[PDB]
Design a binder for this molecule. Structure first.
Ligand code: HEC
Ligand code: HEC
Ligand code: HEC
Ligand code: HEC
Ligand code: HEC
Ligand code: HEC
Ligand code: HEC
Ligand code: HEC
Ligand code: HEC
Ligand code: HEC
Ligand code: HEC
Ligand code: HEC
Ligand code: HEC
Ligand code: HEC
Ligand SMILES: O=N[O-]
Ligand SMILES: O=N[O-]
Ligand SMILES: O=N[O-]
Ligand SMILES: O=N[O-]
Ligand SMILES: [Ca+2]
Ligand SMILES: [Ca+2]
Ligand SMILES: [Ca+2]
Ligand SMILES: [Ca+2]
Lengths: 520, 75, 520, 74
C-alpha cells in the first residue's frame, strides 16, 4: 500500500511545482502516486539532482482515481478497420503509389485506428524500422489494453543484439527517427530537451539511434499530454507546437488575434543545472483544438533538402522538428520560409513536399471553428446519463458512434439519418475531386518519361517540375487529412480544383513540347 | 479547490484513526475530502472536542475518485 | 418401395466390396439403395461384367438416411456474392486483365459461391464452353436444390446438334476439357480410368470431346467423394491427389513425415478384365485437410508448353492432369520437375505459370495446421444444440457465419468482434501487398512495348521475361488463394514482397536499357 | 457463492481496467457475468428456464398456502 511522503520537504526545493500543485485540483494528491524519490531526497542539493527519482509515465497512474476516463480512452473501436493500406482502389488514395513514388510512405501507409495502438503501430508499420519490430503473434493485434500497458509486452525485436536501422524484409523502409516518437508517447518527457536539441541533461535527442530510443518507450498518448499532473489544469507538452504558438509568436489561432488572446498558451520552462531544458504550454481554457494539435497537424519530423540549393537537411537541423502551423493556401510560403522540401519524385524528379494529417490547420476558418466548436465537441463529447455523474468520453472516434451527443444536440432540426447524409454529401463530393486530382497528376507523371526520351529540354522539364510541386501540394493535403473534406469543405474544393488546374497546365506544357520534338 | 490539512496533527489526538488510515489503501487520502475540522483544530484538546468538526456523508465524497462505482450504483 | 437383394450373391464375385461393406457402418445398408443389378447378376461371370448394373450417383441416394447432412450441404449462402468478376477495382485483383493477358481467365473469373452450384457454374462461365451453356433463364441462378438435382434440369445447350467447342458469343473462350470435371462432379467415377488415361473400359478420358462428356454429368460434389459408400469410412477419390500422395510418395503432409504416417492414405485399386482401372485412397482418419485437397489445390488441368523448348503439351500428356503438391516457395521447382508452363503473356511474351486456389498447400506449416487444426474446424464444424443429436454441418462457408463453433470455442479470450478484427487485420494487410504487387507488375508490363519499340535487345527482354515468371508466381498465388492471406499470413507477406522485388528489378533493367537506346 | 456473484459481479471488458458493478439487480440483466461464467453447459435461455422452473413452482405453493390460510381465517 502507498504511504504518503512529506510534500513540504519537496517544495523546499521545487518552488515551481509548489506554485502549481498547491493551487489546482490535485492539491490533495500526494507525490507518491507518481514519484519514488526517497534516495533523491537524501542526495539532492538545491541545484543538483543527486540520485534520480523514479517518475511513473504509465496511464494506470491516473486510472486509480479516474477509472471512467481511462476505460473510455483504452476502448478499441473494432469498426475502425486495422492495417488498411490507403494505396488501394477502395481506400483514400487509389493512385498513391504512382504519385508518392520516391517517398518512404510508398512502403506502407495504413488508415489510422484507435489511439491505444499508436505506439505499437508506429513500431510495426513497414515504412518505419525495416520490419525489425512485430507483434508477438498475429493475435496480439486486438490487444488495446496490452499496448497501453506497454509496447514491449506485445511486441518482439528481430535482433536485440544490434541497434542499427536496417531492412529485415525486402519491402520495408527505415524512415523512423526520434522526432516521430513525440507524437506517439511522452514517456521521454524528462529525457528530451526542448525541440530535441543536444543537451547535457538529455539522454535522447533528434540525433539519437532511434532503435535504442524505441526500446526505452512503452506507453501511448499519456494522460499528462493534455493535463498537467501537478495542477490538473489544461496544457500541451509538444515542443513543436509550443515553438509555433509561442516562440514564433503565431498564436493558438493564427487567423484570429482576439481568440488567440482569449484562448492562449503560457510557456513554462524547467531547468537542469540552471540552464533551460524542457517546456510545457499551459492553456487559458480546456481547449481541445490546441490539445489535439499536438499531433493532428502537418509537420516536419524527418530529414529533407533545401529548395534553394538541393542540399541535405539532416536530423541535426532544427528544421527536422517543425510545425508549419499554416493552412493549405499558406503552406508553400511556410516551406519557402524554412527553405525545405521532403523528397524528389522518383519518376518526375520534382522537388515535392510530403503532407501529413493537417486536421488542425484545415479546421481553422471553417464554419464550426468560427462558431467556437472544437475537436472534442464532435470526437470526445460529454457522456449523457439518465442518472449519474457526467464525465467526458475519452474514446476519440468518429461522431457517427454518438450522434446524439456529437451533432444532434446542436442540430435539433435533423434526425440522425439527415445528419449522416449531410456528412456523406461532403465526403462523396470531396473524394470525387481527390480521385480526379489523382487522375490528372498521374497523366502528368506518365508524360515525364515520354518527354525525357523524346529529348524535351531541361528548361521545359523544370517548368513542369515546378507545376508538379503545386499540383502535389493541393491534392495531397486532402488524402493526408482524415475528414475527407468535412472539416472545411469549401477549402478542400478550392484546393483540389487548383491541383487539377496545375496538372492540366503541366500536361499541356509536356504534350506540346513532345509534339514539337517529334515534328523536328 | 480543496487544500490538504496536516493529518499528522490530527493523529496526535486520533490514534485510533491513525492506526486504520496509515495502514490501508486510503493512506494518501487527505482528511479534507470528508471532514471540515478547521475550527475543531483551533479549539480542541485531546480531552475536549471543542467545536464539532463537520463530516460529509454524501456519496459524492467518494464519487470524485471512484466515479465508476458511483455511476453504477445510482443507475 | 425398395426390395432388398441378396448381398451374399454379389459378394461371391465382389470380394473387395465384401471386405469393406461387412466391416464398416454400412454393413446393414442393402445394395438396392444405390445399385440396380438384376440383369447384371443374370449375365456376369467372375471376370466379365455382362450387362452393366445401374449405379446411383445422385446425392439424394444418401439423403434418405442422412437428411441433416444433405440439407446442410445444399444450403445456398446468399451473402456469397454470385457471378462477381475478380478483375474489378472492388474485388480481388483490380489489375488482373493486364497481368493475365494471354490466358483464358481474362474472359471471366468470378469469386467462388456455394458448393451446390459448382457444376452449373463450371458449365456457364464465359471462359469454359464458348457460351454454349446457359441457365434456362436468369431466375434459375438462385436454385441450389435444382442444380444438385441435376445440371441439365436448370441449363440449356445452344446447339444440341453439334459437339464441337466453339464460341457462341464473341468474348468467350473454350478452356474446358475433361480433366476440369474431376473437381466438379464424380458422376463419371466408373467411366474414367485413373488419371484419365486411355483405357478399354473407360468411356471418357483426358482426350474426350468435352461437350459430349459434359452432357453425361449432372451432380455437384457427390457425397461419396469423401465417404466410401461401402464402408462409410473416410476417403478421397481424386486421381491427381492419390498420384501426388501415394504414387509419387510425397505423403499427405509433405513437410511432416510423422503426421503423414499417422494421417496417411491407402490406395485401393479396382480392375476391369483383370487390368487396373480406377482407384480410391482410404484415409487413416477423417482428415478434412486431405478431403478438401481433392479440389482446393494448385493443379494442371489443361494443355500448356515445355519450359525447355517451348513445345506444346496436349491433353494426351499425363502432365495435363497433375497436382504439384508444393507450397509457393517450392512451386517453381515443381514446375521445372515436369518441364511445364501454362501460357505466354500477351504483352511481355514471358512464359508464365497459371496458379489456382492453392488453399491446401498454403495452409501447410501455418500456426493452425501445426497445431492439428483442419479445414472442417473452421469451415464445417459440429452443430451445437441445446437438446439434440450432434451432427457435422456440411455447409462449407466462411467461419464468420458460425464464429461460436468455428473460432471462439478455441479462442475463449476473444469476443466475436475481436476475432473478426484479427481476421480483417491480416486480410487488409495482405490485400494491400497484393495491390502493390499488381502496381509493380503493371509498371513492368507497360515497359515491354516501350523497350521493344526503342530497340532494346532480345537478351535484355529475355532477362526481363525470366524476372516476369517469378514476379507473376509470387503475386498470383495470393489472388488465386481465397483466404486473402489468413491461412498463412507470414508466407503471403514474404511471397508478395518477393513479387515486388522481382518487378522492381525488371523495371530497373528495362528503364536502363531504354535510356541507353535513346542515348545512342 | 455470495450475493455479489449474482447481483453485483465484476464488469467484463474487451479492453480496460476491471471494476465491480455496484448496480445491485437481478442477474437476468447480466447473465454472462452472473451465471453463465460458472454454468458453461447452459445457454442464457436454459439458465432463465431453470430460474423460472423454481419460481413458478414456489409461487404455486405460495398461492395454495394463501388459499388455505384464507379458508381458515374465514
Ligand atoms: C532540494 C534539496 C531538493 C529536494 C528536497 C527535492 N528535490 Fe527533486 N530535484 C531537485 C533538483 C536540483 C533537480 C534537478 C532539476 C532542477 O530543478 O534543477 C530535481 C529533479 C526532480 C525530478 C525530475 C527528475 C528527472 O528525471 O528529470 C522529479 C520528479 C523530482 N525532483 C521530484 C521530487 C519529489 C517528489 C521530492 C519530494 C519527495 C523532491 N524532488 C525533493 C532538488 C530537490
Ligand atoms: C487520486 C489519488 C488521484 C490520482 C492518482 C489522480 N487524480 Fe486527477 N483528480 C483527483 C481529484 C480528487 C480531482 C478533483 C475532483 C473535483 O472535481 O473536485 C482531480 C481532478 C482532475 C482533473 C480536473 C481538473 C480541473 O477540472 O481543473 C483532471 C484533468 C485530472 N484530475 C487528471 C489526472 C491525470 C491526467 C492523472 C494522472 C497523471 C491524475 N489526474 C491522477 C484525484 C486523482
Ligand atoms: C499524439 C500524441 C496525438 C494526440 C495528442 C491526439 N492524437 Fe488522435 N491519433 C494519433 C495517432 C498516432 C492515431 C492513429 C493511431 C493508430 O494506431 O493508427 C490517431 C487516431 C485518431 C482517430 C482515429 C481513431 C479511429 O477510430 O480510427 C481520431 C478520431 C483521432 N485520432 C482524434 C483525436 C482528437 C479529437 C484528439 C484531441 C482530443 C486527438 N486525436 C489527439 C495521435 C494523436
Ligand atoms: C505529430 C506531429 C506526428 C509526428 C511527428 C508523427 N506522426 Fe505518425 N501519426 C500522427 C497522427 C495524428 C496519426 C493519425 C492520423 C493519420 O492520418 O494517420 C499518425 C499515424 C501514424 C501511423 C498509423 C497510420 C499509418 O500511416 O500507417 C503510423 C504507422 C505512424 N503514424 C508512424 C510515424 C512515423 C514512422 C513517424 C516519424 C517518421 C511519425 N509517425 C511521425 C502524428 C504524428
Ligand atoms: C488530450 C488529447 C487529452 C488526453 C490525452 C487526456 N484527456 Fe482528459 N480531458 C480532455 C478534455 C478536452 C477534457 C474536457 C475538458 C472540458 O472541460 O471540456 C478532459 C477531461 C478530463 C477530466 C475531468 C472530468 C471529465 O470531464 O471527465 C479527467 C479526470 C480527465 N480528463 C482524465 C484523463 C485521464 C485519466 C487520461 C489518460 C487516460 C486523460 N484524461 C487523457 C483531454 C485529454
Ligand atoms: C464536428 C463539427 C467536428 C469537429 C469540431 C471536428 N471534427 Fe473531425 N470529423 C468530423 C466528421 C463528421 C468526420 C468524418 C467521420 C465519418 O465517420 O465520416 C470527422 C473525421 C475526423 C477524423 C477521422 C475519423 C474517422 O473516420 O475514423 C480525425 C482523425 C478527425 N476528424 C480529427 C479532428 C481534430 C483533430 C479536430 C479538431 C482540430 C476535429 N476533428 C474537429 C467532425 C468534426
Ligand atoms: C481520492 C482522493 C479518493 C477519495 C475521495 C476516496 N478514495 Fe477510495 N481509494 C482511493 C485510492 C487511490 C485507492 C487505492 C487504489 C488502489 O487500487 O491502490 C482507493 C481504494 C478504495 C477501495 C479498495 C480498498 C481495498 O481493496 O482494500 C475501496 C472499497 C474504496 N477506496 C472506497 C472509498 C469510499 C467508500 C470512499 C468515500 C467514503 C472513498 N473510497 C474515497 C482514492 C479515493
Ligand atoms: C440408410 C438405408 C442409409 C443410406 C441409404 C446411407 N447410409 Fe450412411 N449410414 C447409415 C447408418 C445406419 C450408419 C451408422 C449410424 C451409426 O452411427 O451407427 C451410417 C453411417 C454413415 C457415416 C458415418 C461412418 C463412420 O463414422 O464410420 C457416413 C460418413 C455415412 N453413413 C455416409 C453415407 C453416404 C455418403 C451415403 C450415400 C452414398 C450414405 N451414407 C447412404 C445409413 C445409411
Ligand atoms: C471439388 C469436388 C471440391 C471439394 C472436394 C471441395 N470443394 Fe470447396 N469449392 C469447390 C468449387 C468448384 C467451389 C466454387 C463453387 C461455385 O459454384 O462457385 C468451391 C467453393 C468453396 C467455398 C466458397 C463458398 C462460398 O460461400 O462462397 C468454401 C468456403 C469452400 N469451397 C470450402 C471447402 C472445404 C472446407 C472443403 C473440404 C470440406 C471443400 N471446399 C471441398 C470445389 C470443391
Ligand atoms: C481441382 C484441382 C480443380 C480443377 C481441375 C478445376 N477446378 Fe474449377 N474450381 C476449383 C475450386 C476449388 C474452386 C473454388 C475456388 C476458387 O478459387 O474459385 C473452383 C471454381 C471454379 C469456378 C467458379 C469461379 C470462377 O473462376 O468463375 C469456375 C467457373 C470453374 N472452377 C471452372 C473450371 C474450368 C473451366 C476447369 C478446367 C479448365 C476447372 N474449373 C478445373 C477446383 C478445380
Ligand atoms: C468432403 C468434402 C465431404 C463431402 C463431399 C461430404 N462429407 Fe460428410 N463428412 C465430412 C467430414 C469432414 C465429416 C466429419 C468427420 C469427423 O469425424 O469429423 C463428415 C461427416 C458425415 C457423417 C457422420 C455424422 C456427422 O458427423 O454428421 C455423415 C452421415 C455424413 N458426413 C454424410 C454426408 C452426406 C449425406 C454427404 C453428401 C450430401 C456428405 N457427407 C458429403 C466430409 C464430407
Ligand atoms: C480456421 C483456423 C481456418 C482453417 C483451419 C481453414 N480456414 Fe479457410 N478461411 C478462414 C478464414 C478466417 C477465412 C476468411 C473468411 C472471411 O470471411 O474473411 C477463410 C477463407 C477460406 C475460403 C474463402 C471463403 C470465403 O470468403 O467465402 C476458402 C475457399 C477456404 N478458406 C478454404 C479452406 C480449405 C480448403 C482449408 C483446409 C486446407 C481451410 N480453408 C482451412 C479460416 C480457416
Ligand atoms: C446466484 C447464485 C444468486 C446468489 C448467490 C443470490 N441471489 Fe438473489 N436472486 C437470484 C435470482 C436468480 C433471483 C430471481 C431474479 C429474477 O429475475 O427472477 C434473485 C432475486 C433477488 C432479489 C429480488 C430481485 C428482483 O427480482 O428484482 C433480491 C432483493 C435478492 N435476490 C437479494 C440477494 C441477497 C441479499 C443475496 C445474498 C444473501 C442473494 N440475493 C444471493 C440469484 C442469486
Ligand atoms: C455493500 C452493500 C456495498 C456498498 C454500499 C458499496 N460497495 Fe463498493 N464494493 C462492494 C463489494 C462487495 C465490492 C467487491 C469486493 C471484492 O473484492 O469482490 C466492492 C468494491 C469497491 C471498490 C474496489 C474496486 C472495485 O472492485 O470496483 C471501490 C473503489 C468501491 N467498491 C467503491 C464504492 C463507492 C464509491 C460506493 C458508494 C457509491 C460503494 N463502493 C458502495 C460493496 C459495497
Ligand atoms: O538510423 N539512425 O538511427
Ligand atoms: O506518420 N505519422 O504522421
Ligand atoms: O475441344 N475438344 O473437345
Ligand atoms: O477454375 N477452377 O479452378
Ligand atoms: Ca480510422
Ligand atoms: Ca510534412
Ligand atoms: Ca465466395
Ligand atoms: Ca495451375
Amino acid at each position: 500500500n502507498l504511504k504518503p511522503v512529506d510534500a513540504m520537504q519537496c517544495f523546499d526545493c521545487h518552488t515551481q511545482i509548489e506554485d502549481m500543485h498547491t493551487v489546482g485540483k490535485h492539491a490533495t494528491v500526494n507525490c507518491v502516486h507518481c514519484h519514488d524519490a526517497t534516495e533523491h531526497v537524501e542526495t539532492a542539493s538545491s541545484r543538483r539532482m543527486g540520485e534520480r527519482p523514479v517518475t511513473r509515465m504509465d496511464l494506470e497512474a491516473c486510472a486509480t482515481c479516474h477509472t471512467a476516463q481511462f476505460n473510455s480512452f483504452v476502448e478499441v473501436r473494432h469498426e475502425s478497420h486495422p492495417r488498411l493500406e490507403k494505396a488501394t482502389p477502395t481506400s483514400r488514395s487509389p493512385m498513391f503509389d504512382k504519385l508518392i513514388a520516391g517517398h518512404g510512405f510508398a512502403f506502407e501507409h495504413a488508415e489510422p485506428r484507435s489511439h491505444a495502438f499508436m505506439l505499437v503501430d508506429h513500431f510495426v508499420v513497414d515504412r518505419a524500422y525495416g520490419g525489425r519490430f512485430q507483434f508477438k503473434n498475429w493475435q496480439k493485434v486486438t490487444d488495446g489494453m496490452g499496448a497501453v500497458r506497454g509496447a514491449w509486452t506485445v511486441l518482439t525485436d528481430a535482433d536485440p543484439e544490434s541497434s542499427d536501422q536496417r531492412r529485415f524484409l525486402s519491402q520495408t523502409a527505415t524512415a523512423a527517427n526520434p522526432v516521430c516518437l513525440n507524437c506517439k508517447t511522452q514517456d521521454h518527457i524528462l529525457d528530451w530537451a526542448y525541440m530535441g536539441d543536444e543537451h547535457e541533461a538529455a539522454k535522447w535527442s533528434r540525433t539519437s539511434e532511434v532503435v535504442e530510443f524505441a526500446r526505452d518507450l512503452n506507453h501511448p498518448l499519456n494522460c499528462f499530454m493534455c493535463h498537467d499532473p501537478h495542477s490538473a489544469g489544461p496544457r500541451v507538452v509538444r515542443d513543436g507546437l509550443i515553438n509555433a504558438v509561442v516562440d514564433r509568436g503565431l498564436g493558438t489561432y493564427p487567423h484570429d488575434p482576439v481568440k488567440s488572446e482569449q484562448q492562449g498558451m503560457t510557456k513554462v520552462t524547467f531547468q537542469r543545472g540552471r540552464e533551460d531544458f524542457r517546456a510545457i504550454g499551459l492553456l487559458d481554457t480546456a481547449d481541445s483544438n490546441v490539445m489535439c494539435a499536438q499531433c493532428h497537424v502537418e509537420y516536419n519530423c524527418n530529414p529533407g533538402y533545401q529548395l534553394s540549393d538541393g542540399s541535405r537537411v539532416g536530423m541535426d537541423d532544427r528544421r527536422a522538428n517543425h510545425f508549419f502551423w499554416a493552412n493549405v493556401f499558406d503552406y508553400k510560403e511556410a516551406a519557402q520560409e524554412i527553405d525545405f522540401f521532403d523528397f524528389r519524385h522518383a519518376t518526375t524528379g520534382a522537388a515535392l513536399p510530403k503532407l501529413q494529417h493537417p486536421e488542425a490547420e484545415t479546421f481553422w476558418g471553417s464554419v464550426h471553428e468560427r462558431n467556437g466548436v472544437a475537436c472534442a465537441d464532435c470526437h470526445m463529447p460529454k457522456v449523457q446519463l439518465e442518472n449519474g455523474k457526467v464525465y467526458t468520453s475519452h474514446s476519440q472516434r468518429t461522431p457517427r458512434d454518438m450522434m446524439g451527443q456529437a451533432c444532434l444536440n446542436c442540430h435539433a432540426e435533423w434526425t440522425e439519418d439527415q445528419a449522416l447524409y449531410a456528412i456523406d454529401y461532403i465526403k462523396n463530393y470531396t473524394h470525387g475531386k481527390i480521385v480526379k486530382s489523382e487522375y490528372w497528376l498521374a497523366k502528368m507523371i506518365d508524360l515525364f518519361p515520354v518527354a525525357k526520351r523524346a529529348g524535351v529540354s531541361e528548361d521545359v522539364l523544370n517548368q513542369a517540375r515546378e507545376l508538379h510541386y503545386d499540383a502535389h501540394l493541393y491534392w495531397e493535403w486532402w488524402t493526408a487529412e482524415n475528414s475527407v473534406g468535412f472539416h472545411n469543405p469549401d477549402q478542400a474544393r478550392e484546393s483540389l480544383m487548383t491541383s487539377i488546374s496545375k496538372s492540366k497546365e503541366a500536361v499541356s506544357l509536356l504534350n506540346d513540347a513532345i509534339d514539337a520534338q517529334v515534328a523536328v
